[PDB]
Design a protein around this ligand. Structure first.
Ligand SMILES: Nc1nc2c(ncn2[C@@H]2O[C@H](COP(=O)(O)OP(=O)(O)OP(=O)(O)O)[C@@H](O)[C@H]2O)c(=O)[nH]1
Ligand SMILES: [Mg+2]
Length: 167
């Protein structure tokens, strides 16, 4: 009765995919990483009395030139799409990523959510909250902003994708 879930985290490089994930899994914030390498963490969390066994696939960053498969993996239960609120490039990229992702998954009922990370960098913001929100809304996707410096916001992200998959 302990459920098993695999989540893939996608996004442009340096948006904080690894930082968010590491914050969630190990409760700490890093300043460095291995950018171009796929990393897969395991995490146990209880959500609403229900135990979940998480596999989190921290992917190598993608851009407009990254290859997306034409078919989906049945063993992946949700997708977290991450951009940085400090990078317009990361934001335009996340739209391309989403579009190719939709090509891959088709109409299958596997949730995809949108996360604008680095909300703590107040003075470097180039993407408004509204733009992220309305993008997500246009995808019928959940939206959150986050800071890998703030454990609760990282928790909220992974908690939310699990809640979407359970719908
Ligand atoms: N202030 C602040 N810095 C962040 C945040 N998230 C990530 N960073 C910093 O941004 C840089 C890139 O973060 P990563 O987690 O390595 O980004 P990534 O998406 O894993 O990048 P790739 O692995 O190359 O795809 C690192 O120096 C982090 O410390 C954040 O939420 N707030
Ligand atoms: Mg990464």
């Amino acid at each position: 009765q302990s459920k098993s879930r695999k989540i893939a985290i996608l996004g442009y490089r340096s948006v904080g995919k690894s930082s968010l994930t590491i914050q969630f899994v190990e409760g700490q914030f890093v300043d460095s990483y291995d950018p171009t390498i796929e990393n897969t963490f395991t995490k146990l969390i209880t959500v609403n009395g229900q135990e979940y066994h998480l596999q989190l696939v921290d992917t190598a960053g993608q851009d407009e030139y990254s290859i997306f498969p034409q078919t989906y993996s049945i063993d992946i239960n949700g997708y977290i799409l991450v951009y940085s609120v400090t990078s317009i490039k990361s934001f335009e990229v996340i739209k391309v990523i989403h579009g190719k992702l939709l090509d891959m998954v088709g109409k299958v009922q596997i949730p995809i959510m949108l996360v604008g990370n680095k909300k703590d960098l107040h003075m470097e913001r180039v993407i408004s909250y509204e733009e992220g929100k309305a993008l997500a809304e246009s995808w019928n996707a959940a939206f959150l902003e986050s800071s890998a410096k703030e454990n609760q916001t990282a928790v909220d992200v992974f908690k939310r994708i699990i809640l979407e998959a359970e719908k």
